Design a protein around this ligand. Structure first.
Ligand code: NA
Ligand code: NA
Ligand code: NA
Ligand code: NA
Lengths: 420, 423, 417, 417
């Protein structure tokens, strides 16, 4: 570390000698893990490079479509590039999705009908999916439930997917048509599901039912591993372009990838029956989406490095963390158990102060939920960010970092508010 | 008093002949009183829009450039308030995210219907693009209303008019009818589009038996053609395309839904998802163009109306049955011409393409049980407030002309097209 | 005529009074023949623009989204060819990179002048924004023509007209005179703008003595107001702003230079740099709006002209001196009104701001109304005035005649009852 | 620890061979300490950018969408401030209006020169693109400095170094010398680019003789490669391109000028016009991308530096002469390789094209690989070479080190096995 970097961190940010010694130890400790992620990153960069070349991407795919957007070659080729990367029959990538929940919800709705049953098998889903499902019948929101779609949820057993109950439900209920698997844990204290764990779960599903649609919410997992859920038997997946796969450059949108049958059904929900993905001009965003995809394998691993570094420094400082720095990652999220409300809030506020945009904004608990979100793209979580519900045992979630230098610095700034 | 240089260019470059120029002079004189009538309406509508801008205090800060989630895009949210004011509705939902007007119409229907509910169309067969929304072919799996348990009834016209007595009989008999669908603009037929005063009476009749059924009007092509909109005469919810009238020729994509807050809000959950609705959705930097387009819409709409009315008269002077007639007061921007001959139809449509500023050199081909042909040489792909024309190829070979960013363009296009049929 | 609900809304919202509404009905009737005349010109110009589009085979592929160097931006390069066709010139250079019209004008001048050359303005004192380009304050270091050794001469008007005999005497005497500057639109004065036929005669006189001197015309506010442009009557080079007439109210920034290839090319080296010229310059995805703007320009321009003409008549009927009169055939979109009272001027201009769709609530030495979609776009309804005797105000623009008309009624109602 | 499937894919898709893979493992190990060194600089620069953003209080409101004149575009004005903070200068002028880096350099030059002034280049012959700006071909009329009466002196290098004693002698004898031109990055030559410490000494020597002469540094390709910039060691004004380092691979066009307010302001009058300068100029909605690109610039620049250093070592290990050597600390992102053979040169450059994500299939006197997202952006993996003895090729860029690395492997496999 240059003398001038250290002087500046101490004077400008009040980073103290205690935190700097933790920093030196943590950075040395994560070196072998980091070399492991570099190998994945290189494979993934090549994977993406190959897809671009096989689709013959050129300046002409950087379209500026208008109106109906009939024959937007840029738009249609990107879908082909995503299908190739995910090893799927089809893909549907659009700026029109307002967030990742929109993509997930469209995949769900598109592939469900009255009297079908949807079954989540990783316990309670992410809060934003509750209205899509219809978990509150005092509200009229056009949920699955309101359209006659039944819902089953399998709690985790011994902290793992209760695969024996999943199989028994499949044997006993012919109306189950789609199983929902969530790759990234939300607000809990449980490790996100690795690709090999998804692979086994699907292997067990197929022993019982070869037809049920297996859907995986892939948000935050893209390019973290050398494979995606589609490589291990997922029929359809969805995610958000302002997380990993947009490389920090995409300004909005989402994707759905998988079997043509299922992707196509989702598209009729995203637009309307009879139109699907055949119309939809793209506002001039195609170059950003392409460049973002190309930079995604790299930026994803900057973020993963940030998470692994955070896990180790916080563990050394005395905090319980999940996952541990040497637990191989499947997503970019890092959880830290503060066990103290003030420590939680001080930490999150620290991340905001480490942010390039709105660094001066004082984070307020809006159970209330506090967030650091000083990013170029509003809501992008590939950029350094953090959030947490305010409740015992005061776990915070950190994710993102356009560069590891930024993530690292953020953590140093934040930890410096908690220990000296 | 066409300038000598204009006449020379038209005759030399476009092979417009003296017979056509004589029809032009007569037609222009014949439609002058009609044009003055539309100017009165335009003035009113221009003022209605200006007041809506000023009441919402539109400023430069509404010309947003939102990203990501688009949480608190003040431009977007204020445009919704401006449209709600113009249409005299509780709410509105205007977004570039709609891929076409069919999407906006579909979202309004899906959002406000549930399994075991019945939707009822009362103006006969809907526009072709709605057939999959409804679910008219049970051999296709397209996620239609029918596939979601929504029943469908359709009331044929009787003696060319909405059969208001059968509509009432259906409402008395069928408790499950939750939404009535009115299409303002006729599609491919030989029937005048429904005027606002006609819609008013239809609704007044519905309200004699049932004050709760949702009255939905597909308002495509009708915005600013009259001094009132369907929402001013009892419509609960309306939908349209921003690349037709209301975009002023400047909007590059999108749609709108307007009406009662309850029904607009339900539509938003179909457009995005339950729980989000219109709370998320950045707008790609399009807001300035949508506002400016709205401001210019009353004007541009009436340029297209004038083109339709002038077309009606001149083709009639040439011997053709047209609909509506030049002096039938309009409710939309569409003009139909019965060519009664396949070649004449095709030649006319190709001539429209050749009169266009974009893709003028493209040779239109007959590209449903019948082939369709289209002239679509426009700055915005598929925009029909720009001069365009289309037709299914079937007897008696009716063609449909609409649009014109300026009346001069529309007029020139008709002369060019007509000079391919008569000499 | 005006619908009852329009009348009521105007009265209730803007306190438009009966006197003003009676003047409206008279003025509108009075200007109808003039309006028919402008419609003939509009029709011709619309056709000539359409023909230029068709001749360049404009297609959706011209709606470019170029990046970096912008090598081979076909939309860019075709628009230049479409303008050159419209203006009947060898070349044109149309770019969003010009920050305003003064930038385009400046580039045309700098590009075609060298040290020891003399520029001569022949319509008296140029618009204030050109003063630094010329270099009229020797206490400022601004990179002016004077700082680069370019001499300047300015011929005053004589009896209100261009002093053509002095122009010719100067040309006979001073062989360093390389460029003559003509300003089509009058600025802040009380003098009618120069019509195309007046420009034709001036250039014919110049050409009696000298066929080599560059004749440059600042064409701002003039585009599509007549059926000809200065390039049709002997101008070697012209320049203007895309946020005035020729952008059709759609263009968001930029400018143009049109004329002989030799002079347009020299201009381009000043806009970028020697050896690059117009060969580089990506265009930010603005191409579709520039093409559409151009297509709608003949129409929008005439809406603004009607607004001026209607304004001239109603204000004359209300008792004010106006220039030009409603029946003086126009060459630009500007209308001047001599208020002879500071408070009447200010109230008028504040009225125009309250009639505006954007920033209608914003409060407003030089006073300005500028509540527009595009910042500083003067094809949109706007007005301005320096605060000095005899308190002349300048109105210009109107995306639609209805908007311009409504604004004049709102503003006039603040002055008379 | 290259994964087995990475290896198989490289061999099977690109015919990468075992010899090249063996050299890869060696070279990667050999450059590790150099890489750790660049990570220290990257961390420092990352922090210095972050501080600049925070000191200017960058917010979502800086992500402007200005129109027309662009008066008070706060995103635009704040970015100038951020740049000025980063470069430790009084002022900066950052605009998408620059068509390339040459435009920015040319404007800084023209803006600060007047007739009878002399410009002196002190690093030998400038980059070819500057020749018309200076005016080196008296048979062309291109608006060059020469055509505006600006004299030119050029001091040849002596024994490969800046001839500082000649520079001082010139300054002592020629009072008309107003600006000194230093080029940081070597062009198409075989000489190491000038390090910041070398620039510091040059300026220190200049200041022993003349405290007033303007010292201009063309900074292209050098941003964020060292922990200081030329403005930190005495430069009065610098210029560069936003589609090179400082755009972070995200900027789609534009350039920057930074330095003393006096000199930057004079440059702005050349970029637009006298009296306007940088006060007008809307920015087409590009602001977010320029801010994010700047934030990512320290990182992306070092990825490109790593690519160059890795290239240097692997190519050295393969038997080629390279400049600089892998262990010569860098000042820019360029790597030169002397092929001593026309075909090897061409084959190498064709390889780089085949490794590109955009236009990878496009076929390619000066040969170039340029399969990039932003047209002409040299921060992305690219290569070029004039075809002349001794067949030196120039490699630069890489949005990620993995990309640069894979490109060198693909290209090198075409030459050895
Ligand atoms: Na694949
Ligand atoms: Na209202
Ligand atoms: Na011409
Ligand atoms: Na500083």
């Amino acid at each position: 570390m240059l003398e001038f970097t250290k002087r500046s961190l101490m004077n400008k940010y009040n980073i103290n000698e205690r935190v700097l010694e933790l920093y030196e130890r943590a950075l040395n400790d994560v070196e072998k893990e980091f070399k492991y992620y570099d190998e994945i990153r290189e494979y993934n960069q090549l994977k993406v490079l190959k897809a671009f070349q096989e689709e013959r991407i050129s300046e002409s795919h950087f379209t500026n479509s208008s109106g109906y957007g009939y024959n937007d070659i840029g738009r249609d080729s990107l879908d082909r590039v995503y299908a190739n990367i995910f090893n799927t029959e089809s893909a549907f990538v659009r700026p029109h999705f307002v967030n990742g929940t929109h993509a997930i919800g469209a995949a769900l709705f598109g592939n469900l009908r009255p009297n079908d049953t949807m079954m989540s098998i990783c316990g309670m889903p992410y809060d934003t999916l509750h209205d899509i499902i219809g978990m509150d019948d005092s509200k009229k929101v056009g949920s699955l439930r309101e359209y006659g779609v039944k819902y089953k949820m399998v709690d985790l057993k011994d902290g793992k997917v209760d695969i024996n109950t999943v199989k028994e439900e499949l044997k006993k209920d012919d109306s189950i048509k789609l199983i929902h698997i969530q790759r990234s844990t939300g607000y809990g204290w449980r490790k996100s599901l690795r690709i090999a764990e998804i692979a086994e779960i699907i292997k067990s599903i197929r022993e019982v039912n070869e037809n049920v649609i297996v859907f995986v919410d892939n948000c935050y997992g893209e390019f973290v591993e050398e494979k995606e859920p589609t490589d291990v038997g997922a029929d359809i997946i969805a995610g958000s372009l302002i997380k990993n796969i947009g490389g920090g450059i995409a300004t909005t949108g989402g994707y759905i990838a998988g079997k043509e049958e299922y992707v196509t059904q989702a598209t009729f929900r995203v637009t309307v029956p009879g139109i699907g993905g055949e119309c939809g001009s793209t506002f001039g965003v195609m170059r950003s989406l392409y460049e973002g995809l190309f930079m995604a394998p790299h930026v994803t691993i900057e973020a993963v490095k940030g998470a692994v570094f955070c896990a180790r420094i916080m563990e050394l400082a005395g905090f319980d963390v999940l996952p541990k720095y040497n637990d191989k990652r499947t997503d970019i999220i890092q959880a830290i158990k503060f066990n103290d409300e003030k420590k939680l809030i001080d930490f999150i506020k620290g991340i905001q102060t480490a942010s390039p945009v709105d660094s001066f904004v004082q984070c307020e608990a809006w159970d209330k939920v506090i967030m650091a979100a000083g990013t170029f793209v509003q809501g992008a979580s590939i950029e350094l960010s953090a959030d947490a519900p305010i409740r015992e045992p005061y776990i915070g979630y950190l994710q993102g970092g356009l560069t590891f230098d930024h993530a690292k610095l953020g953590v140093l700034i934040a930890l410096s508010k908690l220990i000296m």
